[PDB]
Ligand binder design. Sequence first.
Ligand SMILES: *[C@@H]1O[C@H](CO)[C@@H](O[C@@H]2O[C@H](CO)[C@@H](O[C@@H]3O[C@H](CO)[C@@H](O)[C@H](O[C@H]4O[C@H](CO)[C@@H](O)[C@H](O)[C@@H]4O)[C@@H]3O)[C@H](O)[C@H]2NC(C)=O)[C@H](O)[C@H]1NC(C)=O
Length: 400
Amino acid sequence: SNLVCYYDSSSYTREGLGKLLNPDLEIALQFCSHLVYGYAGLRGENLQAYSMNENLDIYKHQFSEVTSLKRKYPHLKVLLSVGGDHDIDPDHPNKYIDLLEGEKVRQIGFIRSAYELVKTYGFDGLDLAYQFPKNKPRKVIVDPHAALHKEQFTALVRDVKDSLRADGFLLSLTVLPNVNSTWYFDIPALNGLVDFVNLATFDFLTPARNPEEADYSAPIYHPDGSKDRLAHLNADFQVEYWLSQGFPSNKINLGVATYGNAWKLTKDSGLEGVPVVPETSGPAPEGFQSQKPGLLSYAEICGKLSNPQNQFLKGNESPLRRVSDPTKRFGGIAYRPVDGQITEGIWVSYDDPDSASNKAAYARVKNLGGVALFDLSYDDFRGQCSGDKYPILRAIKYRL
Ligand SMILES: *[C@@H]1O[C@H](CO)[C@@H](O[C@@H]2O[C@H](CO)[C@@H](O[C@@H]3O[C@H](CO)[C@@H](O)[C@H](O[C@H]4O[C@H](CO)[C@@H](O)[C@H](O)[C@@H]4O)[C@@H]3O)[C@H](O)[C@H]2NC(C)=O)[C@H](O)[C@H]1NC(C)=O
């Protein structure tokens, strides 16, 4: 099976123990069949693909520091990903749709600039993690031209493929969280144009999108205990949609996340950690290592769960508790309510090594191509949790 390891290159410069330098990156490669360098973006002025940190990626060679790892792992394939929900540009918020709707000269400039990034820096191919409009989050028509945009995406993909053919470069698509495949992906047509598709079947709910209630963010199956939950928001619904639309199972990778979605609780959120958790208050305080409100790395979540340091501590120093449905269909929960001396309540939806292993077992049951892991920088690459480095990645590899 494949194990496609995403690498968010912003991790190279993080301040503190979330910093992922190249020796730690290399430790992962014994488990990964592919490494995907994230992320290039689109220029606001002309929609060309470009490095969002040229000083690092180009002038200090981080692109080729990563692609040259093929010298040490000769079968490793290294791709460059465009977009990924990491091209954040509030003053040019329409770039991805404008490229679809673009004049030929604008699209050709994107195709050529992408090609040149792949070739110049030693990549084996390109990942289009296209930043489509997402499902509208439900409180408590996004795109009137979706059908046109589907057709334009097929054509763009066809044109990107053509640019890659003579060199033999790979082309993948990533369907990002809450990107709706019915709206945008002509699945049977895309099958002839791309080598594989990663379905990012996680972050179905997040505190940024869903600040006032919390629910499982990456279940395999639909949780009937999640009152009123939208039925398409689960990994099996997404995978079965791609299979039923005609995509070969061996060309699909199941997306698994190494980070968790963390909500701030209130007293009114009550004492049940099984979701839906009501009356939440947006994102949890950022972790000191990951420094993103509402996200936590696996190491940060592990450090919050019971361990010999914190097991007897009280109030806001007490452990988060594990909530785990015995059927194992839905994923991990780390939880501490607002109660008593505890004033900082938190609910985290995440995969730990065991639930990530179960995602890999589901991939195998459905005869998928493998798993795509988002991303190495939030796996515990230093082994802070148990001493074992990359416990999530290894749990998935073990099962493939
Ligand atoms: C793209 O987004 C659209 C929404 O904008 C999404 O369409 C939604 O799909 C879900 C799943 O197919 C639909 O919900 C189902 O609706 C039927 C018909 O009313 C219900 O009977 C279903 O209830 C059954 O299944 C549940 C889980 O198995 C059970 O728990 C439940 O009791 C029933 O047994 C279920 O609610 C929803 O109607 C549409 N919405 C619209 C507006 O079309 C589409 O799936 C998204 N595409 C992708 C690929 O994600």
